[PDB]
Amino acid sequence: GSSGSSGMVPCWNHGNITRSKAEELLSRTGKDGSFLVRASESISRAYALCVLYRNCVYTYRILPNEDDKFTVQASEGVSMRFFTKLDQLIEFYKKENMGLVTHLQYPVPLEEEDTGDDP
Template identity: 40%
Template sequence: METEGMLVQSIYYGRIGSEATERLLERFGRDGSFLLRDSETVHGAFCLCVRRAPFVHTYRLMHSTDGWCLQDSRTRPQRFRTLETLIENYRRATVSVGGVAPLTDPLDKTQLPHIVGQEFVYMEMSSTEATSGAEEDDRDT
């Protein structure tokens, strides 16, 4: 991730799950808000998650020797040298390209309120007790 540009570094949330991603985008995003996270099921892949009410759409980004591409079984994938160029390509599109919801607002993790950092601590813990505490904290805010 260090070799990627500032955009990717600011929207990369690491190993957060799909439920945590949906909560973040619902709470702090708007239509077109997007972030990048590790895939929960495919090692080395990323998920580009985009809010388009009432849903959060998730697109898997895969890497090969040819570069990065959006995994899509309907079309032949377009390859990009970096994640940054892939994301910027879809951001520049004024309409949905290849079925991807428009990317308008990067959900920059450095711009979120401090409480979000506390929620990540709870979400990354594996015990059930810690997870239920995060949900209780979330309701209090």
């Protein structure tokens, strides 16, 4: 029950993680422009985009389309685009005044053990 792809990969695409985690990470940064993605527990075919703002985590469910395309089911059905790739969907939502609470400022890094000796 694993997966993967060949080629460089972003940092905002954490992966299969629990809710507590989604927020946990954001908290660390504490910036009014943090964001991240994860695999929806309920349905794998779908994703979950978390956006921090004014100390509030706004999760966004991404259900697949007839053409296996990832499209945020936020808006009703007028101001919504359709992308086949995940990254291609995120970037697009980099601008403000779209649908999310805040515009993706910096792709919050994963939670890996970092041990730096010298400054």
